Design a protein around this ligand. Structure first.
Ligand SMILES: OC[C@H]1O[C@H](O[C@H]2[C@H](O)[C@@H](O)[C@H](OCCCCCCC3CCCCC3)O[C@@H]2CO)[C@H](O)[C@@H](O)[C@@H]1O
Ligand SMILES: OC[C@H]1O[C@H](O[C@H]2[C@H](O)[C@@H](O)[C@H](OCCCCCCC3CCCCC3)O[C@@H]2CO)[C@H](O)[C@@H](O)[C@@H]1O
Ligand SMILES: *[B]([O])([O])[C]([C]N1[C]=C(C([O])=O)N=N1)[N]C(=O)[C]C1=[C][C]=[C]S1
Length: 265
């Protein structure tokens, strides 16, 4: 594989869309590779990690409990609710909701959680509280996936998202236990985690949250490193490409391959 930046460029050339990419050391925040890192991209379901960061902050403050059981109605459900559609009788705990939202990308779980933090506005306020002055959520699932050209709603930048994830996972804004919980939810991703592991060389750690939307929008926020360590945050977003889902996935993987082959930078 070519160097990371060369492969990123190739992926744009082949997709006819924009790619946005950060690679950042988790422990220090060193930026290693940056491409369109200050340009806006739809977050799609990647927002679910930030959402559960806000939830965990409420837990730490004593305003929320992961044990608390939430009951909801069938008319509350939106498209793609693999876990939440199964618990209409009995409800789900706040922690189960976060697990469903992160590990299965359950849309209704995310919306229920989003209400508890004050909606898109409340999550955006949380982002401002932790010093992210760029990322914004405006809409609920599933409208937030619309990815209209030129629309700043429901967007982040690769740099902002990487910084935000580092802040949530390592900065002690969250309690140790909450940091540990957020990481474990990413480790437990069932949408892409197992597939990613099956194509990674032995020894490479992965934790992730994926997203997909309209107009080609696709993305992943991930922790990756050799010796079975979460060494780096890697954020990759694609937008405005007409390519198949399969080819988008291949291109994201090709960027991954480039990182793996040229890791010591
Ligand atoms: O196996 C050996 C080969 O491994 C890589 O090839 C990669 C390629 O770079 C990537 O484009 C493709 O993607 C295949 C698609 C896999 C999709 C899984 C990852 C997705 C899942 C959903 C979220 C984003 C990531 O895999 C091949 C190997 O199989 C190297 O590029 C190549 O030089 C090397 O000789
Ligand atoms: O020398 C490095 C490695 O080169 C190859 O590994 C290939 C692997 O066979 C292929 O399956 C993968 O595809 C890439 C799969 C990447 C999935 C991770 C996706 C990223 C996306 C962004 C967030 C982090 C995860 O590339 C690597 C590197 O060429 C060899 O197969 C392997 O024996 C060797 O250790
Ligand atoms: B998310 O990206 O907001 C959500 C669910 N989803 C899909 C994936 C994936 O494929 O990796 N991860 N999480 N996306 C949707 O529900 C897609 C929709 C776009 C318009 C209506 S639904």
């Amino acid at each position: 594989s070519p160097q990371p930046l060369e492969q990123i460029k190739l992926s744009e050339s082949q997709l006819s869309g924009r790619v946005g990419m950060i690679e950042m050391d988790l422990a220090s925040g060193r930026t290693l590779t940056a491409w369109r890192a200050d340009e806006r991209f739809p977050m799609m379901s990647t927002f679910k990690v930030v959402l559960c960061g806000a939830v965990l902050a409420r837990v730490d403050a004593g305003d929320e409990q992961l044990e608390r059981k939430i009951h909801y109605r069938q008319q509350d459900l939106v498209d793609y609710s693999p876990v939440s559609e199964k618990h209409l009788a009995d409800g789900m705990t706040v922690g189960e909701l976060c697990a469903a939202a992160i590990t299965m990308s359950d849309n209704s779980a995310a919306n229920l959680l989003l209400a508890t933090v004050g909606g898109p506005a409340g999550l955006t306020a949380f982002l401002r509280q932790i010093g992210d002055n760029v990322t914004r959520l405006d809409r609920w699932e599933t409208e937030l996936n619309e990815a209209l050209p030129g629309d700043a709603r429901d967007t982040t930048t690769p740099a902002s998202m990487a910084a935000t994830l580092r802040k949530l996972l390592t900065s002690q804004r969250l309690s140790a236990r909450s940091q540990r919980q957020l990481l474990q939810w990413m480790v437990d991703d069932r949408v892409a985690g197992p597939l990613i592991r099956s194509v990674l060389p032995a020894g490479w750690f992965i934790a992730d949250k994926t997203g997909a939307g309209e107009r080609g929008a696709r993305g992943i926020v991930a922790l990756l490193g050799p010796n079975n360590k979460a060494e780096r945050i890697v954020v990759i977003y694609l937008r405005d490409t007409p390519a198949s889902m399969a080819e988008r996935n291949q291109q994201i993987a090709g960027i991954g391959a480039a990182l793996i082959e040229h890791w010591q930078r």
